[PDB]
């Protein structure tokens, strides 16, 4: 059985380590990469987590996929933030892609950076190759030229909140502060649409706003071409699907570590017009999302099928954080709901 909120282990004992994470399955085999996290403080001590399974019950300890560097001065040196992990297999070039969540050493969360490396083999080691904020230079796809033509004086919209500043967010003032150096990411995923596109979605714009950006053929890269949805609404910690020609997006607020409400949200096309639904958890403390927080979505084609991963954060010792589980259930117009079970098993 699948028993959410209660203490996982692996096949040696030891307890599963693989938080804000994501699955992949290859040749024969299910692959969980997450945050490994430290019993005291919140920083990584090591960098992402790796654990395989042929049944989604049994997970072995595959060791530290992406590790944290020795060198001096490195973009991934000891002491840099990784999180949210999420990979990817290209088809054409056989590789397997790995893009996260990085804050360098001794910044804090300022540089609001998304990451890269690659690894020929599923369970790693993976190579970095780069990091940065998204898309220098370049304006999203749906910004129109009202907007794109607008100056904000930034000593005119210092106190975050007011009417006005909420206005001049939702116009794009935040991106075009951004525009030069790139647009911020901070929590993230990843999706491999059905013509074998992929897309990198972020929080972006100091986490007050959505983006949506298409990455290169190798998926190493963006293309340029991206979109912004729901400006000033703090949607986080995404987790995508798609099912029968139709995109479903579960996020949460914007809380620290504190459990809310989380959001459905729903689009026919990748980069055309998204729209917020009620939130897709029910029953008792679905209010707050059974206490957990969104991380991934993950499909079973073979049954035409899904399932909702989230952490259950427990920020004084951050190790000790438990994992939610539960399938997702469709109603009569398609919708996706989920319910919790305390135990629940695979078909
Ligand atoms: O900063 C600490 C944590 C992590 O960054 C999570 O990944 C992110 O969802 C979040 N939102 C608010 C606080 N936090």
């Known amino acids: 059985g699948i028993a959410s909120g209660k203490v996982w282990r692996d096949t040696d004992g030891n307890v599963i380590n693989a938080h804000g994470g994501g699955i992949l399955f290859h040749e024969g085999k299910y692959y969980w ?51 949210r992990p999420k990979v990817i297999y290209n088809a054409k070039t056989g590789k397997f892609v790995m893009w996260l969540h990085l804050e360098l050493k001794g910044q804090g969360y300022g540089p609001a950076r998304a990451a890269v490396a690659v690894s020929d083999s599923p369970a790693g080691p993976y190579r970095f190759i780069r990091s940065g904020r998204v898309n220098p230079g370049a ?42 150096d790139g647009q911020m990411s901070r929590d993230m995923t990843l999706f491999v649409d059905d013509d074998g596109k992929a897309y990198h979605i972020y929080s972006s714009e100091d986490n007050l706003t959505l983006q949506i950006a ?29 099912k029968e020609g139709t995109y479903w997006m579960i996020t949460s607020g914007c809380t620290g570590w504190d459990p809310n409400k989380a959001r459905l949200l ?82």
């Open 33 to 83: 990469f997450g945050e490994h996290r430290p019993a005291s403080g919140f920083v990584t001590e090591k960098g992402i987590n790796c654990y395989s399974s042929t049944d989604l019950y049994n997970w072995k300890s595959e060791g530290i996929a992406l590790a944290v560097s020795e060198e001096e001065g490195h973009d991934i040196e000891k002491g840099c933030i990784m999180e």
């Open 139 to 180: 304006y999203p796809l749906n910004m129109t030229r009202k907007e794109r033509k607008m100056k904000w004086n930034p000593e005119e919209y210092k106190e975050w909140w007011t009417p006005k500043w909420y206005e001049a967010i939702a116009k794009g003032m935040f991106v075009k502060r951004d525009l030069k």
């Open 214 to 242: 298409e990455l290169a053929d190798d998926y190493l890269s963006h293309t340029g071409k991206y979109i912004r949805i729901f400006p000033g609404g703090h949607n986080e910690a995404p987790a995508i699907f798609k």
């Open 266 to 347: 729903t689009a026919d096309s990748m980069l055309g017009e998204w729209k917020q639904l009620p939130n897709p958890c029910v029953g008792e403390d679905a209010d707050k999302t059974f206490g957990g927080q969104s991380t991934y979505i993950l499909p079973l084609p073979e049954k035409g099928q899904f399932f909702f991963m989230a952490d259950m954060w427990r920020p004084k010792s951050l190790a000790d954080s438990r994992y939610i589980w539960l399938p997702v259930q469709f109603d009569d117009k398609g919708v996706p709901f989920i319910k919790w079970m305390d135990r629940w098993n695979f078909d």
